[PDB]
Amino acid sequence: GEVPIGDPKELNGMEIAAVYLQPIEMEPRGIDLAASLADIHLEADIHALKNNPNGFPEGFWMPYLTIAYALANADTGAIKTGTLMPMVADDGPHYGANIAMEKDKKGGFGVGTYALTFLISNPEKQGFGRHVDEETGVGKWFEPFVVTYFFKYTGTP
Amino acid sequence: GEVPIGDPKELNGMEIAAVYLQPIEMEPRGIDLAASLADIHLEADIHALKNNPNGFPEGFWMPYLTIAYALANADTGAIKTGTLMPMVADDGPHYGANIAMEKDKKGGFGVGTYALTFLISNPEKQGFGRHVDEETGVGKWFEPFVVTYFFKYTGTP
């Protein structure tokens, strides 16, 4: 029961799609927003495309990535910012985090038209290495870039 | 040109195999041992088995794992300890680190019979989360355990 957000993008050898669903309980606690305090859980699906320049196998999830999120409702003009954390679910590993919408104390994040902007950085920032040998080496990591998606929030599912 | 180390083990829903090859140059520098200072590069191949209890898809690499390594030559009795770093190569993502053998200043880590003991911890230690919902939740993470393999070092390749 996942709601799709806009159209997926293919760049830097990786596929980037966005989906929204019911709030989830993540362990350990005290990190991600409480399920009871959130309305929806936003998850970013990142998988390597064919012939990735980072040596990543097709279909494999991209780990150790630094991904921040920005959601703005075009109707109210309200804008919030946050970061995506790496986690594993029944549908595999992905970057997800509970986010308050209607339950937002500041308000303006209810049902309406919303735009999502994700900021992704190289895995070198998290201490992930890359071979540079002639035999088993790979190309340089992609520079930091942003992706934009547009979708209509039908409310908490 | 990778040399296999002992037999692979299947536990905690993940397959854990060990291999050694020629020294590699990893970015950023100042982390992994210099290629010219090392004799071999030890890499740990970790992929999820069928019906993994962590929700991990079959064949997908296991990320955010904390893995320390111990190599001891039974001939000389010399024993060294170190940690494996996550990195990407042409053959995909794995945990690898350059290690000095014949070039080891302490010596005793040359050609002969060697035993490898890896200490692997839960990814929760590295801040990796896990869903616990009824719909998309997964089982608890595996407790910390050790694995042992036996192989003969034929020298720097």
Binding site: - | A70, A74, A78, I79, T113
Partner: protein, 182 residues
């Protein structure tokens, strides 16, 4: 399958008093019972998890203000039990393994993992000076078996930063072999 219980008291008499009470409280075997500098008393018990938990509870409950410290180690190899109270027979003198760690807690956990992670025989576990002082485990077996056990033990104690040093000694000298046995 077994469990190790540790109780430290500040009084020698109370230590002996707590010893009789604990032994009668449940079916457990006394591993260690001696006075430590400057005037404390150390007690170590072994047995089933249920029995050890009850015995340790009873001892601490009756220890009063003389109680120094207490700890329970569950899921420990059964070969570790007589290695602390005494020495297991070593039919092979071919190779010896020695891992010294800070505190008996780290040494016990390391020895347990070592025996379970190899086919080597655990010779003995020695506490140089109390449960907080330097402790050491002794392993014996094939060269390949001893190395794996020592490596496994080194990682365990090293994870807590209580590891002092590890050494695998194949073909020990006759004078050294006697020292190892004694």
């Amino acid at each position: 399958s077994q469990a190790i219980g540790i109780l430290e008291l500040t009084s020698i008499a109370k230590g002996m008093e707590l010893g009789d009470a604990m032994l009668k409280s449940a079916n457990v075997d006394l591993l260690v019972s001696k006075t430590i500098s400057p005037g404390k008393f150390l007690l170590m018990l072994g047995g089933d998890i249920g029995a050890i938990q009850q015995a340790i509870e009873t001892g601490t409950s009756q220890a009063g203000e003389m109680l120094v410290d207490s700890l329970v180690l569950a899921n420990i190899h059964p070969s570790v039990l007589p290695a602390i109270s005494g020495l297991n027979s070593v039919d092979k003198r071919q190779a010896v393994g020695i891992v010294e760690t800070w505190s008996v807690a780290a040494c016990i956990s390391a020895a347990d993992l070592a025996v379970k992670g190899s086919n080597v025989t655990l010779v003995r576990v020695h506490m140089a000076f109390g449960i907080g002082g330097k402790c050491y485990m002794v392993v014996a077996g094939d060269v390949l078996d001893v190395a794996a056990a020592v490596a496994t033990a080194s990682l365990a104690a090293g994870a807590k930063g209580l590891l002092v040093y590890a050494s695998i000694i194949p073909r020990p000298h006759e004078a050294m072999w006697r020292q190892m046995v004694e």
